[PDB]
Ligand binder design. Sequence first.
Ligand SMILES: [Mg+2]
Ligand SMILES: [Mg+2]
Lengths: 263, 208
Amino acid sequence: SRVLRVVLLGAPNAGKSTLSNQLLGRKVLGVITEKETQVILLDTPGIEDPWKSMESADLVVVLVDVSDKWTRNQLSPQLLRCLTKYSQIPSVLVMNKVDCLKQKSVLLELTAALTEGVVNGKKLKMRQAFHPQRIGWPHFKEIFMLSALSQEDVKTLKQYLLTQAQPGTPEEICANIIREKLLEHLPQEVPYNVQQKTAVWEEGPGGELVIQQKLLVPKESYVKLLIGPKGHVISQIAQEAGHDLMDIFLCDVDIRLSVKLLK
Amino acid sequence: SRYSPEFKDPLIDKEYYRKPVEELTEEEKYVRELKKTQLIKAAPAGKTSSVFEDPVISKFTNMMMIGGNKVLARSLMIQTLEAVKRKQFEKYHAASAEEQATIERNPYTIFHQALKNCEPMIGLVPILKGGRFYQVPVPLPDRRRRFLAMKWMITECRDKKHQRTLMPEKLSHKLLEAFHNQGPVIKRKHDLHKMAEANRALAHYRWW
RNA sequence: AGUAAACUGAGAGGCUUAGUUGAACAGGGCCCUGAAGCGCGUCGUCAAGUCGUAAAGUGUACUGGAAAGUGCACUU
Ligand SMILES: [Mg+2]
Ligand SMILES: [Mg+2]
């Protein structure tokens, strides 16, 4: 039996949660068991929790968003401190959201900047033209270039991680799905200010799951945004939410969404 | 080109045309009917319907050509095949009863397996940005690796360290070395596989 | 592609024409016009230049870590 504790570090919106979900194969600490290997992924908040996770880490996966022009050119100082104090733990660089890059050859230069020209103890000599606060981390064991959103080559990282292993409520679910749909469809802060209240949850005469959920908001403009033109917006949400539920509980579900102002 | 865009390449395969109408799929049937309408180019000097035709040996001969001298290139190729055949017969006649079952005497099998043993799987492609060409590992296509095996064999046989040893004898010896996973060409394949593992930093660029 | 390379002839007296043999490679993206689409965007100052340069809001109260912040009430 082989086990590997891997901790995900990086910027807030570097996609750590997305990559963890893709590795797990489900949108959810996570455990990936395959044959005789067990990989424990520890998702940490973006930059006390990351350091405490490092205290029990066998491998570190440093995610960098290449699409973000502001932060792609350097590793954040706190991340560099984290790696320096735990230099003994192996670290692997993952350049996420490559699909968003228009000119992807840029990646190459970024590597030289992020790895300081050294990877896995070997220098990255590169044909050289015609003749202090650290910016990178020269002790990365390996480099990956992937896009977690499209699952592009996440399988390669999964197989790599498997290789480095060393011998050794339903109402809540429905609320989470509705929250996801609200986030996807509603603008700005509105989906963060919607309170949900389960009104009816029962089994109908035909074996279906009859759900009536109430969407409470503090403002009338939020009600208008929720209902949308001619009731389209809310309607769309319900159907999509219902469709997701079709796959989660494996039955027929009649979900009805009603919007009321918080008094 | 003196040919119009309309003209299509000919298909010299002889067993393709004898395929019975019954085995024809609707798609293959449609292709057969479509070729009836098209204009076809004259078959070039070279490939024929002969059963001894071998495209790989033809390409090797063309790659040994210098100055359009095809007679000499083919003469060298047939001399090499004859030398391989004679050396294997020599080794077979001097071998024990139990070593004779594992001695290959067909020069074509030896040539094909020797070239297959020299094909690389990975290579390096330079890419341009920042003023610095970047050497990224790349999985070679089948055409590229088949070409590289032949090019390495011919360059190894053209080395000037082989003073007055005639090309057929050098090439037969090199082919028989590569048949057994030995020689400088196998080492040149290994030194590229190691120099591509030494540079796995840029190992995932998929858009060379 | 009869292309590169190799080899012959004819001329006007380094240049013009006629032949023979005859390859290898043949994949990714741009500059720039072409084809359209979205957005943005609609500068300041001492005496004018003989100057320089490219969730969000509205009120009110307090503000002694005020290049504006917080508190209370409202609007989309
Ligand atoms: Mg204050
Ligand atoms: Mg205020």
